Amino acid sequence: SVYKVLLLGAPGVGKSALARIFGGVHTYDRSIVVDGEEASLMVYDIWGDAYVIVYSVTDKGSFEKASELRVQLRRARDVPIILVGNKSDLVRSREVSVDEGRACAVVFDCKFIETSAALHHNVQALFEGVVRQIRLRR
Numbered sequence: 001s002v003y004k005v006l007l008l009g010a011p012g013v014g015k016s017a018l019a020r021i022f023g024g025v026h027t028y029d030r031s032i033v034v035d036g037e038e039a040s041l042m043v044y045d046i047w048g049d050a051y052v053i054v055y056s057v058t059d060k061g062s063f064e065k066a067s068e069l070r071v072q073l074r075r076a077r078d079v080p081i082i083l084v085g086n087k088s089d090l091v092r093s094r095e096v097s098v099d100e101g102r103a104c105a106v107v108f109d110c111k112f113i114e115t116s117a118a119l120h121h122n123v124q125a126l127f128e129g130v131v132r133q134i135r136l137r138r
């Protein structure tokens with residue numbers, strides 16, 4: 001019983017940072033307990049049992065690319081998709097709002113979370129969600 005997770009997204013959004021925090025220990029293994037049940041995770045920083053599409057909240061381009069990739073996945077080859085807006089710490093140079101990120105997620109059938117790899121914020125919550133989500137579909 002594997003849980004392979006593919007890390008997708010535009011350049012420099014924080015993909016490896018998120019993976020390296022979670023792991024582990026680019027392929028990153030790690031066994032977490034959600035939310036009563038042990039679950040193992042294999043996180044793939046490619047640049048699947050779930051796709052994590054990362055954008056930077058300070059980079060509106062990576063956000064639109066994120067949406068573009070979401071519709072691509074929806075048309076190709078179902079699997080959970082998590083939309084992640086990383087770098088929530090850079091409050092001055094933010095170009096995408098939370099609600100804009102959360103509203104995008106609903107309409108296009110994503111789970112949504114904002115993280116900051118810099119502050120280790122919601123990184124654990126992200127990967128616990130992925131497990132929960134894989135579990136909704138299975």
Ligand SMILES: Nc1nc2c(ncn2[C@@H]2O[C@H](COP(=O)(O)OP(=O)(O)NP(=O)(O)O)[C@@H](O)[C@H]2O)c(=O)[nH]1
Pocket residue numbers: 010011012013014015016017018047086087088089090115116117118119
């Ligand atoms: N302030 C802040 N900086 C972050 C955060 N996450 C990543 N960064 C910074 O953003 C840069 C890119 O991070 P990285 O994880 O390498 O992104 P990437 O998506 O792997 N880039 P690439 O696809 O080009 O390899 C790094 O210099 C890193 O320190 C975050 O949450 N907050």
Ligand SMILES: [Ca+2]
Pocket residue numbers: 135136137138
């Ligand atoms: Ca189930």
Ligand SMILES: [Mg+2]
Pocket residue numbers: 015016045047
């Ligand atoms: Mg990288």
